[PDB]
Sequence to fold (1637 residues):
Amino acid sequence: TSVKPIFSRDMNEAKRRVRELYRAWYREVPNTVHLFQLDISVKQGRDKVREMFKKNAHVTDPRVVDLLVIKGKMELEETINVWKQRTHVMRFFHETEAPRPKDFLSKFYVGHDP
Amino acid sequence: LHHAVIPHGKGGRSSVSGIVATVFGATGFLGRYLVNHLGRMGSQVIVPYRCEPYDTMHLRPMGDLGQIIFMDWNGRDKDSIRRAVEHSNVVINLVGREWETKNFDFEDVFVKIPQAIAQVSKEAGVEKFIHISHLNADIKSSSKYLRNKAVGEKEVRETFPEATIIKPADIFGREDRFLNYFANITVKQPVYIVDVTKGIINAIKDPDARGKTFAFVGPNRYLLFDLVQYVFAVAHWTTRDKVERIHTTDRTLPHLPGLEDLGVQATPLELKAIEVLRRHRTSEIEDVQPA
Amino acid sequence: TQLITVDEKLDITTLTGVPEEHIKTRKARIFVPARNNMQSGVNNTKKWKMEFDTRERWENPLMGWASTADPLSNLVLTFSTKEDAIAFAEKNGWSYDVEERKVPKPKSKSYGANFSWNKRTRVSTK
Amino acid sequence: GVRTSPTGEKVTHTGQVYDDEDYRRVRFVGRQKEVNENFAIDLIAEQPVSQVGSRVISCDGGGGALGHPRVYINLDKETKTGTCGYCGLQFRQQH
Amino acid sequence: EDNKQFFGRHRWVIYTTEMNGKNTFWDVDGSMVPPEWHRWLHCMTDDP
Amino acid sequence: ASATRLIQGLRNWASGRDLQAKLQLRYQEISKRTQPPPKLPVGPSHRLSNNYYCARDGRREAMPPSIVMSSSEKKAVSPAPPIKRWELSQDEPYL
Amino acid sequence: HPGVLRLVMELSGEMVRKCDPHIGLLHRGTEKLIEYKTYLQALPYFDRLDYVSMMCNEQAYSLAVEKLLNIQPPPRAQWIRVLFGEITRLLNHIMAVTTHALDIGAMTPFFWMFEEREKMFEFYERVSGARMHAAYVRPGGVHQDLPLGLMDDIYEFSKNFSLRIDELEEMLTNNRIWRNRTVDIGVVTAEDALNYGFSGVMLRGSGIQWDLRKTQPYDVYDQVEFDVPIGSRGDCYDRYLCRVEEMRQSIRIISQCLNKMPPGEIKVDDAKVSPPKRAEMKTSMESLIHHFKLYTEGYQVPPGATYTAIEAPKGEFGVYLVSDGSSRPYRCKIKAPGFAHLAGLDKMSKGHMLADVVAIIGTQDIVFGEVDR
Amino acid sequence: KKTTGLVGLAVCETPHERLKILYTKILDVLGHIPKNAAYRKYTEQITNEKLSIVKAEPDVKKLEEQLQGGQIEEVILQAENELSLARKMIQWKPWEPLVEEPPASQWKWPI
Amino acid sequence: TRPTVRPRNDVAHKQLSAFGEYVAEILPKYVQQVQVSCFSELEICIHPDGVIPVLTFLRDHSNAQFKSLADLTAVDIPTRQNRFEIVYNLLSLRFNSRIRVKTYTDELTPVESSVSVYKAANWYEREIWDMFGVFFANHPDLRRILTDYGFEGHPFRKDFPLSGYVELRYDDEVKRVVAEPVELAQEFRKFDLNSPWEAFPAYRQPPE
Amino acid sequence: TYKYVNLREPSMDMKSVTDRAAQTLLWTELIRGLGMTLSYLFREPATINYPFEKGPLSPRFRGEHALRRYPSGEERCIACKLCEAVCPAQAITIEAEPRADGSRRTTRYDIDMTKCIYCGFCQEACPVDAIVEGPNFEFSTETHEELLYNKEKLLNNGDKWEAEIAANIQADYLYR
Ligand SMILES: NC(=O)C1=CN([C@@H]2O[C@H](COP(=O)(O)OP(=O)(O)OC[C@H]3O[C@@H](n4cnc5c(N)ncnc54)[C@H](OP(=O)(O)O)[C@@H]3O)[C@@H](O)[C@H]2O)C=CC1
Ligand code: SF4
Ligand code: SF4
Ligand SMILES: [Zn+2]
Fold:
């Protein structure tokens, strides 16, 4: 069996496209966070961006990484335009605690959380 | 004990937490944000308002469907207070105005009100009676406000002595008094509102921290004039009794713990001032840090 | 036409976007639903259904409703085999429990054999 | 037609009334627990027990194609007399 | 009930004052009416 | 009605479709309610003595769809014969 | 407010470059909610996806289920369904005209014809009782037939409304300024009208002859006689005038439908599809069992896919049903003429200015209930 | 004739030679395709029968009422579209045998 | 069998049967099934390669016009290795006949910009991509229609529940609209109305 | 049959062109529209005073969600759960204990007036005609607490009138 590939041939062009996409999100953050007038340092925004790239690092397929390139590309386009408002850009973060540490005992006090 | 005081599941928005808070006043600033943290906890706020229905309307959908409840009260009677605290778990006392009126002044509110409500709360069987006070409110001179709150501390220690006396610093938030006083025109440590109210809700839901009075500390503690420099660097009712209150006393009290002993992380002035200082037109972050 | 791929495991679990608590915390269960034994009708057999484990249900303190913090606690997926059940369950990336299709016992019972001469198979009433 | 709780307020037709260790009393502050003032259990023994001289009789609910559908009930006992499950009203046979 | 104007202006209630300790000379409500006249007034029947 | 003759002439003059006749403020055209009680007809059922349900076996006629495939000639027909071009309607054509 | 939509236009000024109609604002999850519900319990979803066609969507869903389920409904059911279909067509065209007017300015004809629309809501009140969402068309013929003292009232309405629509054409319709506002804009090449998926009143306006009522009579439409108007240019003036003469033909269809009405039967006589009537329910046994488990369990539907459509006054309102052999529809999907018309917005407004763009949105009956699916 | 009904379709004045040169180019471009498929047979049959209907008919109205798929110039448009598919169907190999089957447990419905 | 039963008309069944046999002969390459249902609409089940030659043929060819495009949904079923179904729907303006072109796909195999051959398919393609995630290759412009922007998860899938995972409200701490894990007030009491005994014996699948 | 619009040109007769030019230069048909709207000025207005004249209805209007009872009898509901089984928005919540005297009954019968879409599927489905849509539409509730009905609210709502629903069921035991 075989698969029609989407964009890439192996993991290498996938890594190249995601690299370039991360460059694009890097040049996307400061101008837009001035334009929408949020409350977050450029360091914090960029570091949670590269945290989001750290979230999906273990993916071992060219197809899924190409599809994430499509995802990040669409999200980057509709944030570089002025469509996605202050609500959604702040919705990328978590300003609703959710402080829950991964202590077994702290999850045991207020329970049924295995 | 009886059921439904046990919590269930997660917290907030029909995720039932286990406390029932009878909150006094709260139509102003700090009680409103504390109601917001209790609705974020998903609790039952019993609030008496003595006002027009419109202001409690604008704070109304903060809590969930029917978890809030509104009722009348006054600073003179007692039957309305007892009807308020019929079935209460805990109660917090936050009432007090920075200016004198015709019928009510600084005296007999801080001298009358916590006596009577602490009396009927001690009668009706509450726990964790949390009374607020200003930071460094003593019998020091030129401050009727500070000496009345100090007498109030003495009275809350007097009747129902197992009460949590708290003393937060000069708060700044979204609707600050003195910052907006600066918008229309000696170290000092101000502390942001969510640090204070997170400390309050953590001290009300983390028992063994009860009966011992607590104090809040601003994590800068520098000069008033450098703060005026910073706020006008970022920003491009005037009775001088207030200005004696903000010039008079600014010190630490190490006789009792603070923030990091409670389970609450501080936030400095600069980031929150970037948050609240809008209104440039229709950044010069100095922070000289005096001690 | 004989292009790229090599047979690896599938990684749709990064594509669904649900958070990690519901990625890894819950466990599926794959089974044919048992015949609703107050009836005896076997049409409700013959489909390999997927369900999830459960969590709490508390009283709504205002009306006495069953309220819960469980988005995925109203799932069932109807299948026709077991291999595709396991393939989809790991394709979306979660652990799982597989059970048995316990068929009925093959019997051969008859009227005259219920009406024998010496044997104890004797209904004594009809 | 209500009883009185140990709290003092109105109980319902179902004995669901609160305690002093509750707080939905404190959500009933200033607004009425609207109780039914006409209980149905009390309004069954008030009815005249019809004593039909037949054996197995019908019940409708008083009106053709209104009320419940028909039900045909037996009247053979003489100590646990007839009762329709729908009509909720008694029956005997009295020659 | 008039028999001169058009439909929907056949019938009208005129409310009175002080009917449940209320002083309702002003601010009349909907459903101050008893139910039989509520049947009459919506023209669910042509009969009083 | 309830209007004088001068404004009656104005309502007839300013738009010449005779407002006095058909004016959408109906006075006694409104039907009397409380109709005498009707009966209702039943069509091809409730006729006894024959009416087998397997005769009018409507639902179970769901045959599975008939398939052609997995994997000299007077042909190349369309799915239907060509649709006839329409007609100029005689009730005021154009033109 | 100038429906409710996001419009993102890009322009050289008092003019254009290109725009993006962003919709999704009124998204409700209707297909998913139908994927968990049964047939009867989700018929109101079809009644209120579009909300103007309060009976035509009912008729389309019911013919989808009847087409799947091998049931030919009785004649009096068909005639009552056709009568209410033409009435709802009348209400839909009159809303399209009046909200086009209230969009353009033009205050008073809106209120004249909303007096008319209040009267027809009153007829729906007498028939079902609901103000607007008279669901009322159960799959398998129309339940709860029309009561005594109605048809002559519809007859009186028909006379008075023919007068009022003549008066509406007196008001609008060859006015100097309305012609001056909208003739020049919105031309649609008929070949591009076929390929861009324009359907309904667009095919009326641009050229080619098409009408589902004349081509595939899915009901007793074949036994009534009318003539559909066609537009001569792509100018939405022609489109408007085509809507008006379709209203006048709707009056003709209602006239013949009151002429030739049979007093046959309300519903089907198949208790395994429709519930029994209440008398036989409360008397006999099988009627009660069919009632009870018909409302709970839901009648089984044989598996298979089907597609159907009617000429809703927007256009080819289509529904695609997918049914596992079950009591639930497995998946349904909607072909929305409003969605397809909204797709071709750039090609209606590539060389014209923004006020006329709003006039182009208004000249096609968008509601953004049906445009969402 | 005067100003036909469809908007974008301007009128024609030369039906005859236009349809003749279009159908001769149809037969040539189909002449590129071998008779290895039956596609050549079907398209050749329908095109030559249509053209031979046209040839021995000189009229206009009888040419419309006889030749189906009316009215007039829509036939010309549709023929130009068929020549477009003829050019596009030198390529794409419709006559070749099948691409590989599915896993074949599929197309029975009731899952 | 005559009254209150939707009658068949097998002349149309035979005509569409002959047309389906015609289609299977003239395009031998990509045909697996040409089925005719008893209510007489054509269904053609298609390998996902020659979809663009099929559409460029069946838009044209002067024996079957089919200019009219309608619904497209890739109706999601599990249990198959190819989960999703692109269901094109077509009607001829000249002929009054409805065909359905159903090609299969799985969660990663695309189609190849069918918008260039049917201009109506643009927001249809963007819709199916947004609601399901079925990527459509070489399409000019893909964006998100009929979802929120910050929302993700491709909600028409079966794995997505009836409710969601995010839920909005207005908090007064930072004075804005924020999201939360969804917290119901009622259960959505799910019913199992799958009562046995086989109301349709015509469709009995065989066991092992 | 097709009866299409606008296949006609303004003919170039001199009287035709001077009448169209008089329409242009003298605004004539505009003034005809003025005369039309003045003809609707002098009409009698088709309004109704609301708080003294309520609008017309039908006997088959769908209203209030009351529970009924028997003629001087028990609760006509049985807790047979059909109304939840067909309630599309699932606003019906039923929990059914049997009472003391052996007969089957309820505990809790709740409607969410927030959720109810007012179809009367429960009206078409209640096997004894207990829950019946009322006549009137006047809730106008200041709170989101009050719009969750309980059994005693529904029974008091049924106590607030019967003779209305008596006339409606007498008008609708024949069709439905
Ligand atoms: N520097 C400071 O002033 C600081 C003060 N605090 C404390 O915060 C608490 C809340 O104050 P804040 O949020 O700033 O704003 P407010 O002054 O508005 O809050 C006080 C509340 O009590 C009510 N109240 C005041 N006087 C009376 C009276 N005589 N009778 C009845 N009710 C009365 C107020 O008015 P109404 O009833 O009309 O709603 C209001 O609801 C105060 O108790 C204050 O001591 C905390 C930190 C710093
Ligand atoms: S359908 Fe009627 S009798 Fe049955 S539970 Fe509902 S209200 Fe009660
Ligand atoms: S009217 Fe409809 S939504 Fe309301 S309770 Fe009855 S069935 Fe449910
Ligand atoms: Zn009975």
